[PDB]
């Protein structure tokens, strides 16, 4: 009775990996589709980390090496006024650096940071920098900003992206309200550890998402419906010296310090802080029983780019100790200050192979920014620590409204239709 | 009524937009993305094959001279088109898709040896 | 209930021109092909025109086939016939009748579902 | 009588010569030769499949159901096709291709419509 | 009976094959495979652009207007199609294809205009 009849144009698709392409300097609602989303499987976060450190990599191909300085450095006590916090946080040192002229040679002194150095065979006068024994470091270029500017992922043809607008989705499982979109909004690489920042906002509650919530084993990622703001800064004026050690080679380091040498450190308003707390409780509370305690505490271990919370304060890199911010115990104009720590030579990724080192910046530091989400682990009584180590949940916090799927125009049904 | 504006539209609704979806389906750093459109362009032209293949060449509805089997799918007219989804329907009968298309092709030689000797 | 209703004509001359339309209602209009049937005062039934519910194919009986259009209007419920050179032999009850095709994803029909009551052409 | 030696003729000489422009369109350092290539290629896909969608596919010259409108040029005949070259046609109607082209496709999908119920 | 499993055959047996080949023509370090694929795809559509030209387009098998010369090849036809194989035949008339092509299309050319003028 019924025949095959053949449709090209057929609205459907199905789950798939491809390649999405960049762009920096639309929607389509589909009123009846549910689909199904599952963050943590979602492979645009895998393309995000690659291009990501990919670019961080390009960026410093054309820049100055600073092997001609693994040499061995005189390291005496700064001459300045220095508060308790910062005793034996700095060390001036001099040492023979090369110049443009490979027989020649120049005395230089500079300021580094102690952890920044390692002493050689338990010699107080010898040490050297940390990166000589592992692979050479690289001079990051000062024409560079380490801005966190936006890209958006764009679909090949052939191919779309479907945004969830569920605003208490929790990243799996069917999404009841679901649109086509060209290309995502942009998303800020903005690199951190424990606190999330300058990310997205909840709609109207605070989402506690987990791959699984009752496995300690994985990281709870929390998303705020309210921002608190931070403000940090390194409040020690620099002045910042160059000498060339190549042919058109030239290292930036911290000359010298004007005034006194405080520590740097972050400031949230003490009450804004509790109240997003409070808010974690509460719905940690629905995974978890009513008549129950949560605990919050301190990082329990692991070196400083796990413990602290990490971040790009105006090119600076700080190590700020969020001890203030998980302490306390939920059972059914003061501010936290936070000491801080400043490196030079980093590693930015979890990497063996790389260091970078970061040029000082002359002058005295500030920037403001919003926590937008954390970073938890789990161990009655449940205890919470900060986590984070893992830069791909980072990433997961924005893209997990996200899925691609490849369009499969054709297919076949029957009609009463025959040639 | 844009692209796949229709995806949760029933199938005999949603077959009215087949020309929004076919012209979307056309438009080392930078060679994934070379890699992506050299891709795009031989999948599109496995599917321009098939249809020529098929004796659907140019066209968007073809009709052809394959019966029905209900042992694919026993829904009756009303219940597929008026009540359906396309997502729905490719799902129902995803199992038997290779062996509706080996028919076509089978379907489509004869045809065409029976045309060239009508021709004589 | 569906309704179809004639609201036709009278009385015209032969080598004239008469339009018949009939309204419907009670149904979704837009899902039905429809046809005329003619019956002569002392005959039974015959086809005359059939038009495709979206109003782009229409069929004749060939005695009709230069001489009449079949239309429709699927935003005013309006089916319409225009008959043109008026034979005395066109004298009949035109009936507006639901039914006598289908199309493609539909069910068949080759039935006519509903009817009106008729108009009365008369030829002088 | 070589590629686009009739470019200076008029429209309905012109017209006799569309096999050779059509064979015409087809045949890190290297990459931007790629990258040339396969632009070029998407280019002459996306013509192909447009002439698919408004029932063109397969040949040069194909007839349409779309009327001419007089707003969009009130030339005759001649004034067209005796003199006229189709460097200055297409200038004189540039403004008017989207929406010609629009009509053409749903010129034919009204088509497919009514063939596929004339065959159930 | 898988791809070229006929070549070994004659021709009349090899024409039912025709699908089989037809579906195998699709489908710094990576480049020189890119090249390949581009190249595949574009040798692929100049022989679909080719059967268009003749009016060949969307079928295997497609029957012109062009008389055989005897001075291409003077066997008959119980001979080459059952006492012959293609890759025999190719070598007979390698010569003579490019004159047979240029045939096919000033056909075409004609075949086109004339059924414009009948659709005035
Ligand atoms: C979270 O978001 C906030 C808001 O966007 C962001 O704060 C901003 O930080 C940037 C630095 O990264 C500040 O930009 C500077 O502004 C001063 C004053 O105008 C300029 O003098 C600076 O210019 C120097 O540096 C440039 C490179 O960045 C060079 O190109 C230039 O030649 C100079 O050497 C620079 O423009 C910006 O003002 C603040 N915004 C506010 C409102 O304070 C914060 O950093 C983000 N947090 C995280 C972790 O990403
Ligand atoms: C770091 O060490 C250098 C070298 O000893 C110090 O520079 C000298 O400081 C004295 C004053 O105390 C001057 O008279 C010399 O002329 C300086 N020498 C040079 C080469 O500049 C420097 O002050 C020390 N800095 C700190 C912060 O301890
Ligand atoms: C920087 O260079 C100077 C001069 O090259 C080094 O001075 C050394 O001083 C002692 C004291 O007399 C001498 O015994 C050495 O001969 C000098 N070294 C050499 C090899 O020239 C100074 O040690 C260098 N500083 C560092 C830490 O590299
Ligand atoms: C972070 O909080 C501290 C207080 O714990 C602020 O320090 C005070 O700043 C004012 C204004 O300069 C001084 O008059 C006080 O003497 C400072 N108090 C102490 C204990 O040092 C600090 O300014 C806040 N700021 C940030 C992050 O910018
Ligand atoms: C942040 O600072 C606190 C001190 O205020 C450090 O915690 C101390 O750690 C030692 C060694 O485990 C214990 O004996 C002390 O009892 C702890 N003090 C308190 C008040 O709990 C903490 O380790 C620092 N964290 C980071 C990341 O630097
Ligand atoms: C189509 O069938 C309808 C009844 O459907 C019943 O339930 C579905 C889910 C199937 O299991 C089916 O086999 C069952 O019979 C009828 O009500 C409807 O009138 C039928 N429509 C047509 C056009 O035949
Ligand atoms: C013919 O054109 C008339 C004039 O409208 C103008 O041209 C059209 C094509 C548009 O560009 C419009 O914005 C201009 O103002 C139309 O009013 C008329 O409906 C058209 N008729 C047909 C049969 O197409
Ligand atoms: C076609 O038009 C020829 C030229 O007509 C004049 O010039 C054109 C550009 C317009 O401005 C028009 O209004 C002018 O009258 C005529 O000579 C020729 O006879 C016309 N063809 C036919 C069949 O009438
Ligand atoms: C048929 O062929 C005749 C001979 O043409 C010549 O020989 C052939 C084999 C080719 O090499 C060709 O290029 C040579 O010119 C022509 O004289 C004759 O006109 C052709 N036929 C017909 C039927 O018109
Ligand atoms: C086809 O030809 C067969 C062989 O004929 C001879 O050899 C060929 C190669 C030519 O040179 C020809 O002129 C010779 O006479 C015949 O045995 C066979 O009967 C022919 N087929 C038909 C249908 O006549
Ligand atoms: C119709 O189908 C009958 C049973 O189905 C057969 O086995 C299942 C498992 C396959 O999915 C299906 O494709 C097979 O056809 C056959 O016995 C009968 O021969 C088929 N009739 C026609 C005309 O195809
Ligand atoms: C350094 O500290 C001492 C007190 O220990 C103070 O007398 C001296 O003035 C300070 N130096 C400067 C430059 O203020
Ligand atoms: C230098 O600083 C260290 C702390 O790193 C301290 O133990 C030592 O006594 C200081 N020596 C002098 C001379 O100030
Ligand atoms: C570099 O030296 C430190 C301190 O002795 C040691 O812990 C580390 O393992 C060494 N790394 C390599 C690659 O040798
Ligand atoms: C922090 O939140 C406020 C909310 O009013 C917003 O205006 C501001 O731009 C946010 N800042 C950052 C760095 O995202
Ligand atoms: C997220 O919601 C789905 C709803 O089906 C539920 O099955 C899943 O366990 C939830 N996961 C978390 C971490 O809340
Ligand atoms: C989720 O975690 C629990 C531990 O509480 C484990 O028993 C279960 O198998 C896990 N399920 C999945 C799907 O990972
Ligand atoms: C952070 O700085 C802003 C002004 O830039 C101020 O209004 C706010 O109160 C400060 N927050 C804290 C915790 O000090
Ligand atoms: C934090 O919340 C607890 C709830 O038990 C309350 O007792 C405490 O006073 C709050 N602290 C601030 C700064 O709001
Ligand atoms: C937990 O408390 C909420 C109110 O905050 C209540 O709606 C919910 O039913 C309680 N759940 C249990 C298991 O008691
Ligand atoms: C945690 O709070 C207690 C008071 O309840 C205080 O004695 C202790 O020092 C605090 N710990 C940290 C790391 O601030
Ligand atoms: C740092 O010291 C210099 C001395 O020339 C002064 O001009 C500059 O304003 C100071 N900057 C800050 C942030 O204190
Ligand atoms: C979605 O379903 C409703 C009925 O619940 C229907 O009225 C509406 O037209 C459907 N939307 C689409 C795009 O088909
Ligand atoms: C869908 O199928 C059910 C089967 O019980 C039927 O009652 C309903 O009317 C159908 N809906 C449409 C739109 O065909
Ligand atoms: C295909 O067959 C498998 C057999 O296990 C079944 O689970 C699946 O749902 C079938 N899919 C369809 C009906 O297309
Ligand atoms: C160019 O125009 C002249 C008339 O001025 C005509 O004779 C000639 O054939 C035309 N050439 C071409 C290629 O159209
Ligand atoms: C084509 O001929 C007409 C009528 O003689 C004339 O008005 C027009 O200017 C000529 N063409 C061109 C393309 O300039
Ligand atoms: C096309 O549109 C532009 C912009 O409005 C106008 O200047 C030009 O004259 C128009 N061309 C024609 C042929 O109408
Ligand atoms: C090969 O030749 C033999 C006759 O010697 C024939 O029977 C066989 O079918 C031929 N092979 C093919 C593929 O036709
Ligand atoms: C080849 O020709 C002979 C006669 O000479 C005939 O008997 C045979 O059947 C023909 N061949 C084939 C391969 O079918
Ligand atoms: C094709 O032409 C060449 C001369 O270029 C000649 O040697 C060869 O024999 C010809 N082929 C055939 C099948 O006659």
């Known amino acids: 009775n019924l025949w095959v009849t053949v449709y090209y144009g057929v609205p459907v698709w199905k789950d798939a990996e491809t390649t999405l392409f960049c762009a920096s300097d639309q929607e389509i609602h589909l009123e009846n589709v549910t689909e199904e989303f599952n963050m943590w499987k979602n492979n645009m976060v895998e393309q995000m980390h690659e291009d990501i450190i990919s670019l961080w990599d390009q960026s410093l191909k054309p820049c100055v090496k600073l092997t001609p300085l693994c040499v061995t450095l005189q390291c005496t006590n700064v001459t300045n006024n220095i508060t308790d916090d910062m005793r034996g946080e700095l060390k001036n040192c001099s040492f023979n650096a090369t110049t443009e002229l490979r027989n020649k040679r120049q005395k230089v002194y500079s300021l580094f940071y102690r952890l920044d150095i390692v002493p050689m065979g338990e010699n107080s006068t010898n040490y050297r920098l940390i990166n000589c024994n592992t692979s050479a470091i690289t001079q990051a270029c000062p024409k560079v900003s380490f801005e966190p500017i936006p890209i958006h992922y764009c679909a090949p043809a052939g191919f779309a992206i479907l945004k969830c607008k569920d605003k208490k989705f929790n990243g799996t499982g069917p999404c009841p309200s679901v649109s086509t979109v060209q290309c995502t909004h942009g998303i800020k690489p903005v690199v951190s550890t424990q606190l999330l920042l300058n990310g997205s906002l909840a709609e109207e509650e605070v989402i506690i998402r987990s791959e699984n919530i009752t496995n300690n084993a994985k990281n709870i990622l929390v998303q705020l419906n309210t921002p608190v703001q931070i403000n940090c800064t390194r409040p020690n004026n620099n002045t910042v010296k160059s000498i060339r050690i190549g042919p058109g080679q030239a290292f930036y380091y911290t000359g010298d310090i004007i005034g006194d040498i405080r520590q740097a450190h972050c400031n949230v308003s003490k009450a804004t802080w509790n109240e997003t707390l409070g808010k974690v409780v509460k719905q940690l509370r629905k995974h978890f029983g009513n008549n129950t305690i949560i605990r919050f505490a301190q990082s329990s271990g692991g070196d400083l780019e796990v413990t602290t919370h990490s971040f790009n304060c105006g090119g600076e890199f700080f190590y700020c100790n969020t001890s203030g911010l998980f302490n306390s115990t939920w059972i059914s104009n003061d501010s936290i200050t936070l000491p801080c720590r400043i490196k030079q030579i980093i590693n930015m990724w979890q990497r063996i192979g790389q260091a970078m080192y970061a040029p000082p910046i002359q002058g005295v530091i500030r920037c403001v920014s919003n926590i937008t989400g954390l970073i938890l682990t789990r161990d009655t009584t449940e205890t919470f620590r900060p986590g984070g180590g893992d830069m791909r949940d980072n990433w997961r916090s924005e893209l997990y409204k996200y899925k691609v799927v490849k369009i499969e125009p054709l297919g076949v049904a029957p009609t009463r239709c025959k040639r | 009524l844009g692209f796949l504006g229709a995806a949760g539209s029933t199938m005999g609704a949603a077959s009215m937009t087949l020309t929004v979806q076919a012209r979307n389906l056309l438009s080392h750093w930078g060679i994934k993305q070379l890699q992506a459109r050299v891709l795009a362009v031989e999948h599109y032209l496995r599917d321009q094959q098939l249809l020529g293949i098929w004796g659907c060449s140019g066209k968007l509805i073809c009709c052809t001279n394959v019966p029905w089997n209900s042992s694919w799918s026993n829904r009756n007219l009303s219940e597929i088109w008026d009540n359906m989804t396309w997502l729905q329907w490719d799902k129902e009968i995803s199992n038997y898709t290779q062996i509706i298309y080996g028919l076509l092709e089978e379907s489509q030689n004869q045809q065409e040896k029976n045309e060239q000797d009508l021709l004589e | 209930e569906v309704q179809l209703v004639e609201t036709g004509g009278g009385l015209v001359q032969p080598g004239g021109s008469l339009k018949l339309s009939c309204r419907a209602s009670?149904?979704?209009?837009?899902?039905?092909?429809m046809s005329w049937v003619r019956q002569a005062p002392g005959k039974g039934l015959e086809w005359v025109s059939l038009i495709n519910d979206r109003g782009g194919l229409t069929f004749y009986v060939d005695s009709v086939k230069g001489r009449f259009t079949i239309s429709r209007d699927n935003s005013k419920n309006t089916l319409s016939l225009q008959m043109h050179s008026l034979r005395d032999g066109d004298t009949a009850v035109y009936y507006c009748?639901?039914?006598?095709?289908?199309?493609?994803?539909?069910?068949?029909?080759?039935?006519?579902?509903?009817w009106g009551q008729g108009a009365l052409v008369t030829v002088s | 009588l070589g590629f686009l030696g009739a470019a200076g003729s008029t429209m309905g000489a012109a017209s006799m010569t569309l096999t050779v422009q059509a064979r015409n369109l087809l045949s890190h350092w290297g990459i931007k030769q790629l990258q040339a290539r396969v632009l070029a290629v998407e280019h002459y896909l996306r013509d192909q499949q447009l002439l698919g969608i408004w029932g063109c596919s397969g040949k040069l010259i194909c007839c349409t159901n779309v009327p001419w409108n007089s707003s969009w040029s009130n030339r005759n005949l001649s004034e067209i096709w005796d003199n006229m070259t189709w460097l200055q046609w297409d200038k004189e109607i540039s403004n008017y291709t989207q929406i010609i082209y629009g009509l053409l496709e749903e010129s034919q999908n009204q088509q497919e419509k009514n063939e596929q119920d004339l065959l159930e | 009976l898988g791809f070229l499993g006929a070549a070994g055959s004659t021709m009349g047996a090899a024409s039912m094959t025709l699908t089989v080949q037809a579906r195998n023509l699709l489908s710094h370090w990576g480049i020189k495979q890119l090249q390949a694929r581009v190249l595949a795809v574009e040798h692929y559509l100049r022989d679909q652009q080719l059967l268009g030209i003749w009016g060949c387009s969307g079928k295997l098998i497609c029957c012109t207007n062009v008389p055989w010369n005897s001075s291409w090849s003077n066997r008959n036809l119980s001979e080459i199609w059952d006492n012959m194989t293609w890759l025999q035949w190719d070598k007979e008339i390698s010569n003579y294809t490019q004159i047979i092509y240029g045939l096919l299309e000033e056909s075409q050319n004609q075949q086109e205009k004339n059924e414009q003028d009948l659709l005035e």
């Open positions: 009670g149904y979704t209009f837009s899902s039905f092909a």
């Open positions: 009748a639901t039914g006598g095709m289908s199309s493609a994803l539909q069910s068949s029909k080759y039935y006519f579902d509903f």
